[PDB]
Amino acid sequence: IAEFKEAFSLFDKDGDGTITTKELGTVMRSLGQNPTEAELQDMINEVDADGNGTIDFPEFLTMMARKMKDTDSEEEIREAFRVFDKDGNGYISAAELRHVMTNLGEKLTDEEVDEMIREADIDGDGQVNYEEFVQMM
Amino acid sequence: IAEFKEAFSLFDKDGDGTITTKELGTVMRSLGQNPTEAELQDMINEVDADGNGTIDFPEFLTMMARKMKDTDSEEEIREAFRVFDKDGNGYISAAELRHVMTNLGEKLTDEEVDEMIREADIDGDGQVNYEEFVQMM
Amino acid sequence: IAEFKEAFSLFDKDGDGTITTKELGTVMRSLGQNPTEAELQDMINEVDADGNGTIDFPEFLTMMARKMKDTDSEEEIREAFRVFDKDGNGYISAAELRHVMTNLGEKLTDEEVDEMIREADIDGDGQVNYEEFVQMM
Amino acid sequence: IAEFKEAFSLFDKDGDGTITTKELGTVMRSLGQNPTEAELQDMINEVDADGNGTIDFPEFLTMMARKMKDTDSEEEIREAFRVFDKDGNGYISAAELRHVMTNLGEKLTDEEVDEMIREADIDGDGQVNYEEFVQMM
Amino acid sequence: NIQGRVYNFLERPTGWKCFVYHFTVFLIVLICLIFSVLSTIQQYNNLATETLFWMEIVLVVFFGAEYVVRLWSAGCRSKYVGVWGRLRFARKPISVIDLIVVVASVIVLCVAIRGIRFLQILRMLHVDRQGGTWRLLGSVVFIHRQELITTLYIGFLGLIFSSYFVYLAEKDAIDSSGEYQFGSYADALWWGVVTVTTIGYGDKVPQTWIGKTIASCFSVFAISFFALPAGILGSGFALKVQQKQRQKHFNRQIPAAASLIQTAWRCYAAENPDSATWKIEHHRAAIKVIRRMQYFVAKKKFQQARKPYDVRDVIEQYSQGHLNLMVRIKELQRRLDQS
Amino acid sequence: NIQGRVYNFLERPTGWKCFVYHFTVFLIVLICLIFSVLSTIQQYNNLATETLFWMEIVLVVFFGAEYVVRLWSAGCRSKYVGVWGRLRFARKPISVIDLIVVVASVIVLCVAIRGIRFLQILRMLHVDRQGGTWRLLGSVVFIHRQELITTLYIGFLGLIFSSYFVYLAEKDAIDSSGEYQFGSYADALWWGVVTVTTIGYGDKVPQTWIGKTIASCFSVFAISFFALPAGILGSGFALKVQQKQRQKHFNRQIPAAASLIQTAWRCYAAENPDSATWKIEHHRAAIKVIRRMQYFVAKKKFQQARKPYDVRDVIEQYSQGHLNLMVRIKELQRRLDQS
Amino acid sequence: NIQGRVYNFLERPTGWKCFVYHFTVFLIVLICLIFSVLSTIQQYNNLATETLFWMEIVLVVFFGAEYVVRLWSAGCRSKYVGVWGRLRFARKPISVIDLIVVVASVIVLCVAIRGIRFLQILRMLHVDRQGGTWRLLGSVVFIHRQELITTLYIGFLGLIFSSYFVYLAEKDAIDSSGEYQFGSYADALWWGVVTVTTIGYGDKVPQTWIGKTIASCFSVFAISFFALPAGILGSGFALKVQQKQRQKHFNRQIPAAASLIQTAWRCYAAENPDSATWKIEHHRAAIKVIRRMQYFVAKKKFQQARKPYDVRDVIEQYSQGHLNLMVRIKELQRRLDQS
Amino acid sequence: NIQGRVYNFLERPTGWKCFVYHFTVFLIVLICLIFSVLSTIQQYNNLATETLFWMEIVLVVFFGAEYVVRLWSAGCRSKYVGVWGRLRFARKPISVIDLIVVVASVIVLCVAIRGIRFLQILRMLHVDRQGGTWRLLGSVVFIHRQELITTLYIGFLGLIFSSYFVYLAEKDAIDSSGEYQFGSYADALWWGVVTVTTIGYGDKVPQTWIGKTIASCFSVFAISFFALPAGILGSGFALKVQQKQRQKHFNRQIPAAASLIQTAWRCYAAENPDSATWKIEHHRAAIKVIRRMQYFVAKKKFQQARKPYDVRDVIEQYSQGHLNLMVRIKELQRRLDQS
């Protein structure tokens, strides 16, 4: 319990006791992502609980305490798939899913898509049942 | 059928499989039009069907598959003429039409206006019946 | 009748047949006013009747054909005075009127204010009847 | 009575009879505060009574004539405390109050907070009764 | 062009002079109705007939002459020019109503009270020429088609159920004089219709405590479902009225209107290889597509010029300005890094 | 200036002290009415007359003195100064009503119950002095003039048709006691008026299944057209109220108000060739046109300062800022390309 | 995939061809009800029974075949595939109602008028399949839950108090024929329920001046509290309708929808140390937190894409643009101070 | 802190556990009322008395114990601490009502049916503790105070005039049985009150054509003025509800709240010359004025953080950004002209 001190200190390089935009940007650049100032702004804003522009340690605990598999969040993933379903029947073609996940948004690489298509689509036929795929995730 | 591959490839000079703003601007500049970035932005936006900022080939087919002579579009041209009609009677003076089409908007050259005034205004008198003119077009 | 050709041609130095922002600014600068681009923009906009950004001669006739002493415009001047009247009784102190007309808005010079205070305030006492003053103007 | 002439003249260094943004900024910089143009803008706006962008002497008297201990202003201070009260019971922990007043907003120094915590919190225990604290101020 | 002058007066009135004429015609028609009402009363039956004879003989002639003048004056518009154009004008429902009433009055005077009495009522539909009231009400109702259907369906279902329950609880009760009030399901349904519309004639009242309890629980809830369409339509009318104060000024839509027509003509003109529009050879294939895009851009821009203001225009304006300033700033940047 | 002090108290009350006075006057007037009502009843006829005599003899004197004091105090405003100015003040409808009621009361006391009874009712119109309620209702109704006319017309037409059909279906049916209820079109119309306004006295009820079916189909649809004006007006009132929370603060409209007056005076002053305004020779012709443009600009700017906030102001603000920044950026550009 | 084609026709109609079929079924069902009503009347009792027998024997068969076809066609959706999936489909209330009515009709025909008469009424609940009307009304009511409770509570309290006061003032008064109308609190409450809902049967009217005064003061104030829910709901419906004209276009929400799914999968994939997502060693702890933040950012961005436009989006857009331009300007500044 | 735990349960319920308790108490109270109603009926008079005795003897004890527990638990809040603080709590109207009902029940049981019957009605006012319904209705009514007064005044005036005219036209007409219906102005006024509120008991109906014409012209116009307050209030409620979807998120108002308190304390601290706030000698006079300005700035900023979004915030945001960018651009300009 409370091993998050290590990660929080890793993010807090200068040790002021808070996480600023510059530190987050430097850590991201250490991984070669090269984000813009705006993305860092939204990322910090989405966690900020006292509305000061920085991230304190208890806010870090609060953010890390959240968990998935809640219905209010599972419904979002369910609704996201229904945008591409042309009939709402619960089936989507493998080729369409591959094209969408490769050529839009985050643009995953082919290797991640291939692992995904084997973790799902146990049916093997032309249509993939995405409801159980969402359930597993 | 499907001869649009030639035109689409002509627009797609670099061959990435899509039509970007730079390619459209270069093609336009090859014709000496010199548009601004904003005009290209709206022109690409008006066709974009997946909302990515670029034009794919199936979107090109979808755009080219649209046809005029639909009532929902003919009514627009009919309403456009009624702005200049001072009485809504369906008649407009030749001089007023010439002045409007020469000194406003796209500012056509005199030769195009002259061909237009002979393709229409078969009445020959002071007033031109624009309803049949819209019907022919 | 139609002596406005001289003034319109005076404003139209280059003789294109229209009045552009540059010509108006040059004429104003010839009088030492030095306006900003925005003021010229509103001044041209307030007259423009075809919405092209320039002023044509018939629009100049239309603007010059307007006349004051219309109730819809006299009520505006009447309402403007009531802002400074602390009681709505139809009386305002001479000192307050002088201070307002000298230290706000267009900031007239003392000589114009003095001519105004003698063209009005025939009462001579501490309060000036502005209703008849508006009526005369 | 009317000793405010000295302070008003002190603010009005150039003696034009009004208080402009430059004079206020210079006076503030003489004290080492270094404000931005926007803060001076709001500070002048909050007093301006004739809407000209400057401060006249009678407006200075009007602003200085206002007094605290009015219910419409005391309710604001009462509502401000209730944001941090987790129960609305009228009690707040000393540590939470110290942290809030040191790490947010104006960020007072420790010495001011210490004088405050002794001017209030006569109870001495873990919870401070802020209602009487607001009443005294 | 006196033809258009007459057509404006008869069909499209705007002045007080035409207002007085239409007001006089409407009041004459209304005065005609009142004497018809008094003719059914036995006391005034005799004189009313002779008065109505001389009123009708002049009113049928007045309306007959007006119709033919209206028909002739309709040829000023190009929409109705020609014989087939005028036959297209008589196809309008108002002209049909006028023709029917004139012919029926002539036939009635040729030869029956139940016919002339109805004709004098149908004559009231003449006052409104342009059909504005219907053209407004129909649109406002059509916008809200879903909720009206929902509330009517639910109210009807509630009425059907509650009336049957009341009939079950009431069919064996005798009145004070003695006549089984709820002796059939039809009588209970007639009672239910009277109560849901909050009329309450009082001819049928429940007699047993079960019926009274059911009616008390029924009234407070099912009544609202029948006063709801008025509440929906009034709010719709008010909201539609509010938008009239935010209209884009008509003077500013002219350039887009001109641009749409010009771009449409330019797109059409490409079909002739020798048209003068080429004066500005495989490039023509791309030229046609460029003009095709421009036509859609112009059409989209035209529609926005006829709508009231909205936040979307602000968002779009900021979008355009931001990239314009951005590219100029980047250009100045590059000019600086040149050295 | 005690004249203005008195006029403020009588005509333009704002304080609780004036509120108490007006409340007392209104309650005295209302108490006067109640004793008039009880005088018609035979039991209390005698004493009520003598009580009303002594009430009226003092109330006519109280109102008479108040009128002349009100008339004299009206001269503080420049609008009513002078003899003709005061005669202009008595032209107002409220003063006319007060004069009429005072004179009529004096004449009645000089010499009839049907007159004094009506006078004591007309006295209630005194409480409201400024006419605010009418000034609000009239504007709100005038804004929505079209839809009220539409709904009233349609409802009236539906009533006229349905009542005639019911009369046709019902004229031969006998009542239980025996009296032909729908013996004429007038009786059917009286029934129709009662039903559309959902009153339902129950004195006339259809007797045959055809009439009942027609009335059932008629009520559920034509009733809404008569409860609709209230729904329109309530929504209009609420929407008008909402705008009061978005008023531009009164302190910020002063500079535009000063600018309008100054520009108007400057435009007028050009008529005198020797006016001091020339101190700032064919240039005067262009100077007059420049001032003419400035007058219109100032007048346009004044109107926007009295309206509530709207998206158009945001669009205009962005428009001005964008070109300002644009021209400065271009200036810096040119400064750079200088080298 | 004819299974899906059939399921679309039966469950999810959109075309005029399906509209005609549903309209025919609904009108047949409605025609069934009318003959049931006429059977209670003694005159038409005989023939109606034999007509209803042959109507019911075919209508029960028609509905029975339709149910089994509907059940089989429901397996095209993955939600209902499998035996347990189909048993999940029959759990829906509409299927339960259909099964109940079919079984009850079969049992009734096997063997009672009070049962078949009720069954022919419950059959009307078949027309609406998707449950749209309830799905709309329930949401609209749920949004405004507080004010409806408030107004109902206040109206009920006022009714309870006023009825008791009227009972106190009226319990000793005799009617004209002679029957104590307000002989108990229950009768006064029955009178109160009739008056608050503005029905007014007129069977019970106050007789003493105290009761009349109390009722007059009561009606003008407590009536409004029972016509208020309709006014609230109508305005709510209209305001909800207005938002439909400001929908963000569905074509623009696709990239956010894709991004949400991709970020969620990337966040999940970190659990396997050998997953290919690592191909882009204590840095993994920070990588997981970065992906955790990105998931929340994407989820927040998705929700905004499904809401109508609002001023908050304008504020946020200006916020982003301002700092973007600001940092670029500062960069150009630094480039200049380099020299 | 079990005192606060108890006070939260009794005074400030939020959970389903407390919901069940309050629901049970309310249903017990409601069940108490029904047996009171049935006691007035002669048939059930006997048993109801003995049942009510044993119900009341336990209900008075239950409410008595609850009151003292509620009073003790109220001391957890600093607002009610101390003896005078608790006496301040009992000053609330709800506590007064509870004390009155408990004492009255005890006294009644000590010694009368007309008292206990009223007490069992007043007990219904216990269910709502926080006073939310009144706190909402009062505010909503207070916002729209002007239009309600206007419509009520106009409707009352119209009623007064029309009723007198009808009385004048009707006072000499005999009924069928024979009893002058409009024999006095009071009877005509009673008829008028019944018609304006669209109740229509039907006990008084006009008999002469003049009265019928006047009533027909009166109903269609004066009825709307009495159904208008409901239409105003419903729209007001809906518009107030709509604003709840545009609330500024509560998390973002914290810094302004802290800043207000800090600036207020700093402004106060200047009164002591030796306070540590001076550690940051005629400059103190200007320092006090600077802090005075800062206090007003902070107070103004606090209020904007509690209001919903509006276009004014967008205008202000653009205003600030424009000058910020402008001054930076001018600074870069000057840096360039340096060379």
The three-state DSSP-derived secondary structure of E46-84 is: HHHHHHHHHHHHHHHHHHHHHHHHHHHHHHHCCCCCCHH
Establish whether chain D is in contact with chain B, requiring a minimum of 3 CB pairs below 8 angstroms. Answer: no
Pairing of strands D18-19, A127-129: unpaired
Same-domain pairing of D96 and D65: no
Q: G322 in helix, strand or coil?
A: helix
Q: What distance in Å separates residue H257's CA from the closest CA in chain A?
A: 12
Helix runs in chain F, H state only: 2-11, 16-40, 45-73, 83-89, 93-110, 113-122, 132-143, 145-170, 185-196, 209-222, 224-243, 254-269, 283-304, 311-337
* CA R_g for chain B: 19
Instruction: State the first-to-last Cα distance of chain A, in angstroms, to the nearest integer.
Output: 25
Pick from B25, B44, B70: which residue ends a domain?
B70
Whether A94 contacts A121, CB under 8 Å: yes
Q: What is the C-alpha separation between E86 and E101, in angstroms, rounded?
A: 20
E-H CB pairs within 8 A amount to 7
Structure tokens at A132: 């159980």
User: What is the CATH classification number for the domain harbouring H44?
Assistant: 1.20.120
Whether E129 contacts E11, CB under 8 Å: yes
Q: Which 8-state DSSP code applies to residue G174?
A: -
Same-domain pairing of A51 and A116: no
Residues 6+ apart with CB under 8 A from C53: C44
- CA torsion sign for H66, H67, H69, H73 is positive
Same-domain pairing of G237 and G273: no
| Phi, psi of E248, rounded to the nearest 5 degrees | -65, 135
Residues of chain B positioned with their CB less than 8 A from the CB of G251: 49-51
Is B125 in CB contact (< 8 Å) with chain E? no
Pick from E241, E266, E283: which residue ends a domain?
E241
Same-domain pairing of G13 and G43: yes
Block residue for tokens 């209702």: F137
> How would you class B75 by CB atoms within 10 Å of its CB: exposed for 0-12, middle for 13-18, buried for 19 or more?
exposed
Which residues on adjacent β-strands are paired with residue C129?
Answer: C91
Amino acid at D70: D
Is A9 in CB contact (< 8 Å) with chain D? no
Same-domain pairing of D45 and D9: yes
Q: What is the C-alpha separation between H223 and E97, in angstroms, rounded?
A: 34
Q: What is the C-alpha separation between H219 and H155, in angstroms, rounded?
A: 12
CA distances from B93 to B87, B96, F61 (A): 12, 5, 76
**E strand or H helix at F250, and its extent?**
none
Q: What is the C-alpha separation between B9 and B55, in angstroms, rounded?
A: 12
Q: What is the C-alpha separation between G145 and G150, in angstroms, rounded?
A: 9
Whether H93 contacts H122, CB under 8 Å: no
Structure tokens at C106: 């267009």
Domain assignment present for H137: no
Q: What is the C-alpha separation between G171 and G186, in angstroms, rounded?
A: 11
**E strand or H helix at D42, and its extent?**
helix D37-45
CA distances from G134 to G22, G119, G227, G281 (A): 19, 22, 22, 57
Resolution (A): 3.5
Q: What is the C-alpha separation between H238 and G231, in angstroms, rounded?
A: 9
Q: What is the C-alpha separation between H244 and G164, in angstroms, rounded?
A: 39
Same-domain pairing of H118 and H198: no
Same-domain pairing of H9 and H112: yes
Residues of chain H positioned with their CB less than 8 A from the CB of D80: 257-258, 260-261, 302
Helix runs in E111-177, H state only: 113-122, 132-143, 145-170
Q: What is the C-alpha separation between D117 and D96, in angstroms, rounded?
A: 12
Which chains would you list as touching C if contact means 3+ CB atom pairs under 8 Å?
B, D, E, F
- C-beta atoms of E255 and C51 within 8 A: yes
Structure tokens at H116: 């206990």
Nearest by Cα to E5 from E79, E76, E88: E76
User: What is the CATH classification number for the domain harbouring C122?
Assistant: 1.10.238.10
Structure tokens at G268: 């999940």
Same-domain pairing of B51 and B85: no
Assign 3-class secondary structure to C15-77: CCCEECHHHHHHHHHHCCCCCCHHHHHHHHHCCCCCCCCCEEHHHHHHHHHCCCCCHHHHHHH
CA distances from E200 to E151, F167, F224, G302 (A): 21, 21, 16, 54
Nearest by Cα to E296 from B113, B57, B13, B39: B39
Characterize E211-232 residue by residue with b for buried, 16 or more Cβ atoms within 10 angstroms of its Cβ, and e for exposed: bbebbbebbbebbbbbbbbbbb
Structure tokens at F202: 């129950």
Characterize D93-122 residue by residue with b for buried, 16 or more Cβ atoms within 10 angstroms of its Cβ, and e for exposed: ebeebbebbbebbbebeeebbebbeebbbe
Whether C80 contacts C60, CB under 8 Å: no
Whether F181 contacts F132, CB under 8 Å: no
Q: What is the C-alpha separation between G200 and G211, in angstroms, rounded?
A: 16
Report the number of distinct structural domains present in chain H: 3
Whether G228 contacts E227, CB under 8 Å: no
CA distances from H123 to F221, F259, G190, H56 (A): 43, 66, 21, 12
Angle at G189 between CA G183 and CA G193, to 5 degrees: 140
- CA torsion sign for E76, E81, E86, E89 is negative
CA distances from H322 to B20, D38, D53, G227, G323 (A): 33, 11, 17, 52, 12
Is C37 in CB contact (< 8 Å) with chain F? yes
Q: What is the C-alpha separation between G20 and C24, in angstroms, rounded?
A: 69
Q: What distance in Å separates residue G287's CA from the closest CA in chain E?
A: 33
Structure tokens at F280: 């700032």
Structure tokens at C17: 């047949």
**E strand or H helix at H162, and its extent?**
helix H145-170
Pick from H69, H97, H130: which residue ends a domain?
H130
Whether H182 contacts H191, CB under 8 Å: yes
Residues of chain H positioned with their CB less than 8 A from the CB of A52: 255
Residues of chain H positioned with their CB less than 8 A from the CB of A50: 251, 254
- CA torsion sign for E306, E310, E316, E317 is positive
Mutate to test the interface with F, among C30, C42, C100 (most CBs of F within 10 A): C42
Structure tokens at E158: 């509630």
Characterize H212-231 residue by residue with b for buried, 16 or more Cβ atoms within 10 angstroms of its Cβ, and e for exposed: bebbbebbbebbbbbbbbbb
Structure tokens at H95: 């506590």
Whether G256 contacts G231, CB under 8 Å: no
Pick from A70, A90, A117: which residue ends a domain?
A70
Whether H318 contacts F314, CB under 8 Å: yes
The whole domain housing B34 covers 1-70
Q: What is the C-alpha separation between D43 and E266, in angstroms, rounded?
A: 59
Interface of B with C in 65-104 (CB under 8 A): 103-104
Same-domain pairing of C18 and C55: yes
Whether H86 contacts H75, CB under 8 Å: yes
CA dihedral defined by D48, D54, D55, D58, rounded to 10 degrees? -80
| Phi, psi of C53, rounded to the nearest 5 degrees | 100, 0
Mutate to test the interface with A, among G289, G294, G301, G327 (most CBs of A within 10 A): G289
Whether E223 contacts F220, CB under 8 Å: no
Nearest by Cα to D33 from E87, F195, H290: H290
Mutate to test the interface with G, among F204, F209, F235 (most CBs of G within 10 A): F235
Structure tokens at G78: 């993955």
Residues of chain D positioned with their CB less than 8 A from the CB of H320: 38, 41
Same-domain pairing of F57 and F22: yes
Instruction: Please compute, for residue F275, the number of CA atoms within 13 A of its CA located in the half-sphere on the CB side.
Output: 19
E→H contacts (Cβ < 8 Å), by residue, are: 198, 200, 202, 231, 234-235
Which residues on adjacent β-strands are paired with residue B129?
Answer: B91
Whether H157 contacts H132, CB under 8 Å: no
Q: What distance in Å separates residue C131's CA from the closest CA in chain E?
A: 32
Q: What is the C-alpha separation between B76 and E305, in angstroms, rounded?
A: 12
Q: How many angstroms from the chain centroid is the CA of residue G190? A: 32
The answer to whether D72 is a known ligand-binding residue is no
Domain assignment present for H139: no
Same-domain pairing of D66 and D12: yes
For residue F289, the chain C residue with the least C-alpha distance is: C64
Is C45 in CB contact (< 8 Å) with chain E? no
Q: What is the C-alpha separation between G108 and F40, in angstroms, rounded?
A: 69
Instruction: State the first-to-last Cα distance of chain H, in angstroms, to the nearest integer.
Output: 73
Which chains would you list as touching A if contact means 3+ CB atom pairs under 8 Å?
B, D, G, H
Same-domain pairing of G274 and G218: no
Helices G113-122 & E145-170, crossing angle to 10 degrees?
A: 170
Amino acid at H119: L
Same-domain pairing of D13 and D65: yes
Same-domain pairing of G201 and G312: no
Q: How many angstroms from the chain centroid is the CA of residue B110? A: 18
Whether H191 contacts H163, CB under 8 Å: yes
Characterize E281-315 residue by residue with b for buried, 16 or more Cβ atoms within 10 angstroms of its Cβ, and e for exposed: eeeeebeebbbbbbbbbbbebbeeeeeebebbbbe
Cβ atoms within 10 Å, residue E80: 19
| Phi, psi of A125, rounded to the nearest 5 degrees | -80, -170
For residue H236, the chain E residue with the least C-alpha distance is: E235
Nearest by Cα to C96 from C85, C107, C105: C85
Amino acid at A83: V
Same-domain pairing of H78 and H164: no
Domain assignment present for E137: no
* Conformation bin of residue E42: beta by default, left when phi > 0, alpha when psi is -120 to 50: alpha
Pick from C14, C39, C70: which residue ends a domain?
C70
Q: What is the C-alpha separation between D26 and D24, in angstroms, rounded?
A: 5
Q: What is the C-alpha separation between G303 and B27, in angstroms, rounded?
A: 39
Q: What is the C-alpha separation between G264 and G292, in angstroms, rounded?
A: 9
| Count, residues in chain D | 137
CA distances from F91 to E85, F104, F209 (A): 58, 18, 61
- C-beta atoms of B46 and E263 within 8 A: no
Mutate to test the interface with F, among D45, D46, D50 (most CBs of F within 10 A): D50
For residue H313, the chain G residue with the least C-alpha distance is: G315
Is A7 in CB contact (< 8 Å) with chain G? yes
Residues 6+ apart with CB under 8 A from C103: D52
What are the E-state strand segments in chain H? none
The whole domain housing E315 covers 247-337
Domain assignment present for E138: no
Q: H249 in helix, strand or coil?
A: coil
Structure tokens at F117: 């009874």
Q: Give the residue numbers of the binding site of F.
A: 130
Residues 6+ apart with CB under 8 A from E38: E44, E48, F186
Pairing of strands B91-93, D127-129: unpaired
Structure tokens at E289: 């597509």
Domain assignment present for G138: no
Q: What is the C-alpha separation between D123 and H103, in angstroms, rounded?
A: 39
Domain assignment present for H78: yes
Domain assignment present for G140: no
Residues of chain B positioned with their CB less than 8 A from the CB of A103: 52
Instruction: State the first-to-last Cα distance of chain F, in angstroms, to the nearest integer.
Output: 73
Pick from H88, H104, H130: which residue ends a domain?
H130
Same-domain pairing of E312 and E269: yes
Q: What is the DSSP string of F56-101?
A: HHHHHHHHHHHHHHHHHHGGGSTTS-SHHHHHHHTTSHHHHHHHHH
Which residues on adjacent β-strands are paired with residue B128?
Answer: B92
CA distances from D120 to D83, F33, H276 (A): 19, 64, 16
Structure tokens at E99: 């023709």
Same-domain pairing of D50 and D77: no
Whether H124 contacts G164, CB under 8 Å: no
Pairing of strands C91-93, C127-129: antiparallel
Is C2 in CB contact (< 8 Å) with chain F? no
Same-domain pairing of G327 and G264: yes
The answer to whether C130 is a known ligand-binding residue is no
Amino acid at C41: Q
Nearest by Cα to E59 from E86, E87, E26, E17: E26
Structure tokens at H167: 């009385």
Q: What is the C-alpha separation between C129 and D133, in angstroms, rounded?
A: 56
Q: What is the DSSP string of H88-135?
A: HHTTSHHHHHHHHHHHHHHHHHH--HHHHHHHHHHGGGGS-SS-HHHH
Pairing of strands A55-56, A91-93: unpaired
Q: F199 in helix, strand or coil?
A: coil
Cβ atoms within 10 Å, residue C76: 19
User: What is the CATH classification number for the domain harbouring G171?
Assistant: 1.10.287.70
Report the number of distinct structural domains present in chain D: 2
Which residues on adjacent β-strands are paired with residue F225?
Answer: none
Pairing of strands D18-19, C127-129: unpaired
Q: What is the C-alpha separation between E255 and E25, in angstroms, rounded?
A: 44
Q: How was this structure determined?
A: cryo-EM
Domain assignment present for E140: no
Q: What distance in Å separates residue C98's CA from the closest CA in chain E?
A: 38
Helices E145-170 & E132-143, crossing angle to 10 degrees?
A: 80
